[PDB]
Amino acid sequence: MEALKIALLGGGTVGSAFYNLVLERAEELSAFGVVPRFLGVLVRDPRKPRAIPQELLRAEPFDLLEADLVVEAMGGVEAPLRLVLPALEAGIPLITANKALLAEAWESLRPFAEEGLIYHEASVMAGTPALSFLETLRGSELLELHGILNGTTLYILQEMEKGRTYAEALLEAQRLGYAEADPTLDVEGIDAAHKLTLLARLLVDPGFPFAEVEAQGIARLTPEVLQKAEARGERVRLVASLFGEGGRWRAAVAPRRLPQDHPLARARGNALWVRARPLGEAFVTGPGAGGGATASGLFADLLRFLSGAPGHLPAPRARPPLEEGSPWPGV
Amino acid sequence: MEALKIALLGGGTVGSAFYNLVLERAEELSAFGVVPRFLGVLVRDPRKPRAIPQELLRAEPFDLLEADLVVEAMGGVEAPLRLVLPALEAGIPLITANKALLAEAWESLRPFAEEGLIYHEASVMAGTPALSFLETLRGSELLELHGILNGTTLYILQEMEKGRTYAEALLEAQRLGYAEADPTLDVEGIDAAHKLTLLARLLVDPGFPFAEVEAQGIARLTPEVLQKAEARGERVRLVASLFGEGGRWRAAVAPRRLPQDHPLARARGNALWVRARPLGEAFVTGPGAGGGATASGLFADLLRFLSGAPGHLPAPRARPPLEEGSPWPGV
Amino acid sequence: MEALKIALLGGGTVGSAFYNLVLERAEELSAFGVVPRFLGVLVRDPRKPRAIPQELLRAEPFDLLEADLVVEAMGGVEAPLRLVLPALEAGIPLITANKALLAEAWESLRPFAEEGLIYHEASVMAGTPALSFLETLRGSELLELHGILNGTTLYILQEMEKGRTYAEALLEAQRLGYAEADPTLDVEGIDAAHKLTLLARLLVDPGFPFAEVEAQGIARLTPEVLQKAEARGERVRLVASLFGEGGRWRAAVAPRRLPQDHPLARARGNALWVRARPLGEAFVTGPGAGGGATASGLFADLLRFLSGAPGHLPAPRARPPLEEGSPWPGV
Amino acid sequence: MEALKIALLGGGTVGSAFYNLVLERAEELSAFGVVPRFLGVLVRDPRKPRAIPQELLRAEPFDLLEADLVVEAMGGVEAPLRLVLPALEAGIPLITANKALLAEAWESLRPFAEEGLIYHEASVMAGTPALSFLETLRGSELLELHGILNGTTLYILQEMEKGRTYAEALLEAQRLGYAEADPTLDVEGIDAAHKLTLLARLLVDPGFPFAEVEAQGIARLTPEVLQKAEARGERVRLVASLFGEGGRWRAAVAPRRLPQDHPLARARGNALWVRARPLGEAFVTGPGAGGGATASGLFADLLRFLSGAPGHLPAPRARPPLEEGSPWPGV
Ligand SMILES: NC(=O)C1=CN([C@@H]2O[C@H](COP(=O)(O)OP(=O)(O)OC[C@H]3O[C@@H](n4cnc5c(N)ncnc54)[C@H](OP(=O)(O)O)[C@@H]3O)[C@@H](O)[C@H]2O)C=CC1
Ligand SMILES: NC(=O)C1=CN([C@@H]2O[C@H](COP(=O)(O)OP(=O)(O)OC[C@H]3O[C@@H](n4cnc5c(N)ncnc54)[C@H](OP(=O)(O)O)[C@@H]3O)[C@@H](O)[C@H]2O)C=CC1
Ligand SMILES: NC(=O)C1=CN([C@@H]2O[C@H](COP(=O)(O)OP(=O)(O)OC[C@H]3O[C@@H](n4cnc5c(N)ncnc54)[C@H](OP(=O)(O)O)[C@@H]3O)[C@@H](O)[C@H]2O)C=CC1
Ligand SMILES: NC(=O)C1=CN([C@@H]2O[C@H](COP(=O)(O)OP(=O)(O)OC[C@H]3O[C@@H](n4cnc5c(N)ncnc54)[C@H](OP(=O)(O)O)[C@@H]3O)[C@@H](O)[C@H]2O)C=CC1
Ligand SMILES: N[C@@H](CCO)C(=O)O
Ligand SMILES: N[C@@H](CCO)C(=O)O
Ligand SMILES: N[C@@H](CCO)C(=O)O
Ligand SMILES: N[C@@H](CCO)C(=O)O
Ligand code: NA
Ligand code: NA
Numbered sequence A, B, C, D: 001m002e003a004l005k006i007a008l009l010g011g012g013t014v015g016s017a018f019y020n021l022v023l024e025r026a027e028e029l030s031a032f033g034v035v036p037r038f039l040g041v042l043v044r045d046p047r048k049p050r051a052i053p054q055e056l057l058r059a060e061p062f063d064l065l066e067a068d069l070v071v072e073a074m075g076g077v078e079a080p081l082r083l084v085l086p087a088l089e090a091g092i093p094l095i096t097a098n099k100a101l102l103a104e105a106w107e108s109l110r111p112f113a114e115e116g117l118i119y120h121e122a123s124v125m126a127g128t129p130a131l132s133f134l135e136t137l138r139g140s141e142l143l144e145l146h147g148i149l150n151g152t153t154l155y156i157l158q159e160m161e162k163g164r165t166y167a168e169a170l171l172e173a174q175r176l177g178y179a180e181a182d183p184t185l186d187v188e189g190i191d192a193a194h195k196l197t198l199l200a201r202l203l204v205d206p207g208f209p210f211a212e213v214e215a216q217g218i219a220r221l222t223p224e225v226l227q228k229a230e231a232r233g234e235r236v237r238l239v240a241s242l243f244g245e246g247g248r249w250r251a252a253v254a255p256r257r258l259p260q261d262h263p264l265a266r267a268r269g270n271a272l273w274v275r276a277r278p279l280g281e282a283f284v285t286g287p288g289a290g291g292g293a294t295a296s297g298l299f300a301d302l303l304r305f306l307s308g309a310p311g312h313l314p315a316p317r318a319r320p321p322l323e324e325g326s327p328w329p330g331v
């Protein structure tokens, strides 16, 4: 039996849910041979209302180098980056839900990802299997990937189909805790693009640049546009696509007209749909946002780590696209 | 005594400071023969402790068309846009501190800015005179403009100069209420770019596009880089520049090496430095972030309105630069 | 027109309600010739959730000597005492709701009360008239005073009569914000005894010591005891009494059996009942606790101050009791 | 593996720390063949952010009779009393940190303390050994006992020694979670008196009355008085004393002048100093307040229980003192 010393970065909706999940499931952890011991939780207001004991809160950065694991769910890029890099350099693993960090600081983080030190299941579709799903998909070669990777805009478009307005729906989405701190990252496709980039690096090209993703959000959409779609037997969704074009991988995020009976149009939550050779057509769906959904993901990764498995590795080498089949109907 | 009927969008750091400033200054408003009456205040969560009366809180959008003024401080782009457009179409002015909205939705908002319906002093350097400063500078032809327009990143480089880390500094700026909800906007230079764009449009080209601003943040800077700069007699700052290159106006944001005696280097708050012909060299500095600082700007604009003056107008035409220029050296 | 510079000590349930009441009614204040300007609000957590703008919060003591008025609703004794004494010494008035302070630090505070610098209507029965009521009663000489001066125990006894348990009722009372920080002061009669002492000093003896009050709370009471009372046509209440005994004023707090139709048994809230010569029998009733009720009181006192009236003066000299008539049925 | 069924009364600083400590230490409990199961957690406000699961929160009293243990950390006297008595009558132990309850309701609780049903290590000096320390000291006959038993007022005098004010110091102690809800209990010596009483009953007289303790606080002390003490080679501390006078045990709390080299003067945490025959001179010091410190005590007692040991017993008889004594000089 040994102590698992955990440094937690961020004590918000995700951080808190993870804290409490780890202690609630400490009996599970003991079957893995460990007892969880939080060293501290980095936050901004150590004295306010929060679902973590006050004395564990740290309003200032603390030394991470005696941790066994760093868990991060701070949001942003450069600040978490500078906090996690010394831990990574010392060979301490990172479990993160922070898709922006990974997408936008890959030059610094890729070498540690390659050594199996970064676990990030929660960074795409929360604790819905996404990275694991593509790890198994690597048995086959991708032909096309399409996902609904942002819960806030899904929620908004579902509410707008029901005639509610953009602004009403966004407000609710923020209350449910789905939105990023700034909702612009959700509604302009950027959060989807961060996620798509991580999927591409796992499956098809370990150097895939976030900047190459062409992203457009849901700003031209209205309840009227959606009702007109429905009348054509279609649904409009924000879709994140990965596909070959003239010999290269291309990544896009955009609203798309889908047949109403397509798995992506129907799915209950976030969804990733793939066609691959030789497996065929596979998809996964579940909640893509929220405290508890994300904590599930982070805790999945902690069990992954504890069982002796490495983190999520980039593709070992860029793979050749098989199909030039750039699909699509935009809106 | 007539009602001045205000719809307030947002009840956060800025909206609350504003609401309370209005109440405290109600005497001053009686000097124009009005009494301020808030029709409602749009917020996400009517449950939080808030220095605004429960009964005025709205969790859902409310009709704006009986207002004499819409004051907006909700954040984002598309949602505030869709909420203010109907009021603007009806000839109701908007008072806003929302630089992202103005910068990113100018195709929709420009026509109403041109009619005098948009007041936005608080959108750049908060209640420190910036737009008014430039309105006066229109008496001359611009040669070059350089500003320190992001309060959060000034604060960070000032704190880093004294040896503090990035992460600490950032954390403290968030606590002071200076950071955008997404701090990445501050630290990658995007918020400065938003502000830069609005200065360009006011002064030299009413269609200047936000996408034309070239912007790079402070992510390569450490307490070491800045302390080496001090020993060369320099200060490093993030500077927003508008200057002539090849007969076109160029707009850039980047860390620059300043002589340490330069007004921009010696500024403790945000700062705007202009050279124009025939005035010469003029400079303004003051706080560029914070609830009260921002509320001052919004209230300055409410007084501007009530006095009979129109909003902030874009430049009446585009014109090329008079002289070829250049910013300071990068880092 | 002039500025009324206010230092507020405490930003809790009372402090916040008062802050917001002062700004909401600033138009009333302008008819008195003033505009309210808070210098700062002393609290413990300046960053947490609260119904006062964050920037006005002060987590540490601040200089009060440029205030025109100090308002205190911090709770406790020695800490507020040490904060207000320099202001009192400088001739700056105090408006307080803090009955413990006044009862237990009267040696230090009496000389300032005598000079008319202390306004404390809110310290007994909140903004229900109590001190003003006894100021008018001074036309007559007291024969007996009985009050129901603690809202928490009233609420508990009313709930217990309805069969709810002590512990259920207390919990609700704490949620409604009626209880002191420690409920022991409520349930053992001490808070009632603090209040009774202040009443005695106004009306009958300016040196009346808090230590001479004989106080016993509601700890022997149960729903059964109360139901047995009801069956006898009685109600049990915690009653605060002032009456002459062998030539001296005596003060007690204790549960008493009252006829069910007595004003004290019926009253809607806190109640003060007096028999006096020659006026006869007078009473007053209303809410004795709560944020808004207390803020009413403090704001009444601010208007009192602004109109040129002095604070609540102690009796100029101990008055001779007329009746030896020690009344009573205990329980 | 059997359920250890715990009813927790209180979910605040202490109850939360305890709840989370139990979860984190669940492995350790499997070594006694139990798994901890909380039947419910009594709280005032189920809405606050709290590191305890929503579904276990109870806003109203719940049946305790299926519990193996009641752990209480709700504060006050009468309400916890009425809630724990039925459990105690049913032979369910109580683990408590509530010194006021024990001190003030001993007529009801003594019989159950005598049967081994009450564990209260955390009631004096938190999880620092105090009751266990005295249980060992029963091997000798007490000559005299002197302790620094109030964490808040030590903290205040330590901070005042360094020039800080009372009010500042107090504010900081409240923030650290050291102060009773009513800080007056701390600063007028009453909390030390509560603790003193429990030490007397454990050691020398199982009926010692709380009302017999003579108690005076720190209200006459300033940074000036303490700095003058330093120059005489002395430290002033609030000291709780039990000593023989005229053949009876006397218990007092008061500021005392200590030689600066005395163990009591050099203690950074709370401290208990005893002279007994034939042991000699023994001393214990450690943290006497705080959530985690207190939770350690409660959990120590839960382990004591689970090992088969009974609670803390009162002294098996009263006995007179062996020697006439005397505390240090007052201030
Ligand atoms: N919400 C969701 O549905 C999901 C979010 N994510 C990701 O998880 C991460 C966190 O999201 P979420 O929990 O919702 O965000 P929250 O704002 O709820 O949490 C952020 C936490 O980080 C602390 N913090 C943030 N910045 C700093 C800083 N500069 N210095 C010190 N402490 C800081 C905050 O302190 P404080 O509380 O004091 O302000 C807070 O405790 C983000 O990367 C987001 O993209 C992933 C999946 C789902
Ligand atoms: N802070 C500063 O220094 C400055 C900020 N600004 C700008 O002013 C604006 C507001 O900033 P600040 O007050 O700091 O932001 P805050 O997040 O503190 O306030 C945002 C406010 O808007 C409400 N809100 C947020 N999103 C929505 C939505 N989609 N629908 C309805 N209500 C919403 C919130 O409700 P709730 O409180 O329930 O969460 C909150 O009251 C921003 O554009 C910012 O860039 C400008 C100058 C200075
Ligand atoms: N509740 C009621 O019904 C009534 C109460 N009163 C009296 O009014 C007073 C306040 O009561 P209430 O508002 O309910 O109490 P609250 O705890 O709600 O408010 C106390 C306020 O004082 C601040 N504070 C307290 N102690 C300190 C300290 N040592 N240093 C710095 N700041 C401090 C608190 O800060 P923070 O919020 O950060 O903790 C808080 O803002 C008390 O005297 C009470 O007896 C009178 C009539 C009615
Ligand atoms: N803090 C310390 O250093 C120490 C404290 N103690 C003692 O431990 C006990 C608890 O202290 P602490 O946790 O600091 O106090 P807190 O006020 O922080 O916690 C009190 C808890 O009990 C709940 N509560 C309070 N009153 C009632 C009531 N009448 N009915 C039901 N629930 C109630 C509250 O609910 P909610 O959270 O909804 O408000 C809260 O969860 C006290 O007896 C204190 O003297 C002992 C040693 C150290
Ligand atoms: N804002 C994100 C959170 C999940 O990563 C979303 O809506 O999907
Ligand atoms: N985050 C912004 C707000 C002020 O516009 C800044 O730092 O300047
Ligand atoms: N606890 C007090 C507040 C009013 O002063 C009461 O219950 O009356
Ligand atoms: N307020 C108490 C709590 C610890 O029992 C103290 O300061 O000691
Ligand atoms: Na996932
Ligand atoms: Na400005």
Ligand code: NA
Residues within 6 Å of the ligand: C121, C122, C123, C124, C125, C126, C127, C128, C129, C130, C131, C297
């Ligand atoms: Na009153």
Ligand code: NA
Residues within 6 Å of the ligand: D121, D122, D123, D124, D125, D126, D127, D128, D129, D130, D131, D297
């Ligand atoms: Na102890």
